[PDB]
């Protein structure tokens, strides 16, 4: 049974996973939102950030650890592929993303000169991940899953964050319109979000 | 199982794929590797050229404590992370810790050298020895990380425990608490069988 409390930030894309997530599985929860910020907050988590999950006695922080508990308690629909070797293969994904891209999302989200360095390592990584979506659907092809749940609040702030993509990056836009189009996406977004865009 | 492991002779994030392997009593096939030489392959298969790397049939897997969820999953006995999904998350997070309070640290002693990468380690070890030592009390009263029941999280912190004369840390007395938990781990006979004649060298 669901007693799932998410504590998000208004325009936190670490956040926006979750949140995405909590709409995708359709179950119960609460959203509070963070405004970076109450003491329980250091409290819930010793790094000081959200999203922080609270169900009973647990409190989960880090979004991938948040989603892959979710993902489990509901497991409808199916975000990490039920097969061992895929679900393997996703989660090195998943931390290749977090390695390769969202440490730049961090240093964009949380930090001048370091901000350009950024931008450009995203750009440059984006354009390796393009070529995927000549012939994918989503990252794993046909069926959504968790890479694109995580990369989705990324592709959001492309321009928010003031990123710009090679040539080679159209089929990566309209993969990430396919994101955009899910209604919990539309239903997870934030009013703040939405003005991203 | 058709199981092979690249494995780092004194790699300490090999080594907890390694104790993965024997605790589990599977069939496997090791592939020795050797760092001052590394073969062109391991950048092929990995191309963060890294070791550890399992390769199963047209599965390639690098990063230890993803190779050891696999192995964990393709082969449940015995279960090193928790059923309960409550549990298995706490696990979880408590790993992601380690990766990021620890061995962060254990990687630029491991990885980092010459004379540039001195500064860099005296930090790595100041902060691996304070870590550890705020650990240390949970060791009072619990056999193993979890508790009584021997865990992943012992599987991923015993390498750097083991390594601890080898990086020049030296705990205060109050961490012995630890250091009898550790020797809890290592008294294991799979720990045993999956060290390497050199990483048997590391402690007088
Ligand atoms: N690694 C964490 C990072 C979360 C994070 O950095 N949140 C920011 C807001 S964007 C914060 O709360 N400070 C995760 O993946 O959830
Ligand atoms: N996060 C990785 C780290 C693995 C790693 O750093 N391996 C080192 C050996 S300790 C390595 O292969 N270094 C390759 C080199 O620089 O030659 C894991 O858990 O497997
Ligand atoms: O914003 C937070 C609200 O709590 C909202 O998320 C609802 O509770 C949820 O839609 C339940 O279905
Ligand atoms: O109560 C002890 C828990 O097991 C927990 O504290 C973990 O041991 C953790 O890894 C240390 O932070």
Redesign the interface.
């Given at each position: 049974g669901s007693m799932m409390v998410l504590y998000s930030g208004t325009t936190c894309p670490f956040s926006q996973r979750c949140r995405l997530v909590l709409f995708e599985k359709g179950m119960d929860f609460e959203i509070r939102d963070v405004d970076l910020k109450p003491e329980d907050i250091s409290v819930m988590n010793p790094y000081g950030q959200v999203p922080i999950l609270v169900?009973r006695?647990?409190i989960?922080?880090?979004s991938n650890?948040i989603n892959?508990?979710i993902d489990?308690?509901f497991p409808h629909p199916q975000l990490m592929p039920a097969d061992?070797?895929q679900?393997?293969?996703a989660?090195?994904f998943l931390?290749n993303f977090e390695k390769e891209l969202f440490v730049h999302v961090s240093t964009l989200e949380n930090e001048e000169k370091n901000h350009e360095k950024a931008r450009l390592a995203i750009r440059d990584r984006l354009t390796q991940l393009a070529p995927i979506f000549v012939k994918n659907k989503y990252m794993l092809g046909e069926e959504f899953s968790m890479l694109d749940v995580a990369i989705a609040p990324l592709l959001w702030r492309l321009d928010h964050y003031g990123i710009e993509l090679s040539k080679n990056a159209a089929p990566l836009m309209k993969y990430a319109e396919r994101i955009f189009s899910r209604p919990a996406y539309i239903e997870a977004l934030t009013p703040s979000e939405k003005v991203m865009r």
């Open positions: 169900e006695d647990l989960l922080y880090e650890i892959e508990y489990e308690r061992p070797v679900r393997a293969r989660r090195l931390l």
